């Protein structure tokens, strides 16, 4: 499934891309996600929204 990586921070930015396939952990020290097997666009814009590139199709 989709993986942010353990070098990400909290930008919370694929968060608030879609919030549907990443989301804040417990206190939001990570990028959990939620959707483990999405099929939208959102992981394009999370990812490309995404400096960090933490995000990837693992
Ligand atoms: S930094 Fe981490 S919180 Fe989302 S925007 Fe990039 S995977």
Do not use: H, Q, T
């Not at 608030?16 to 959102?42: H, Q, R, T, W, Y």
Request: charged fraction near 35%; glycine fraction near 2%.
């Amino acid at each position: 499934p989709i993986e942010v990586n353990d070098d990400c921070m909290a930008c919370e930015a694929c968060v608030e891309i879609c919030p549907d396939v990443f989301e804040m952990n417990e206190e939001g020290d990570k990028a959990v996600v939620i959707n483990p097997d999405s099929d939208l666009d959102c992981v394009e814009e999370a990812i490309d929204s995404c400096p960090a590139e933490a995000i990837v199709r693992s």
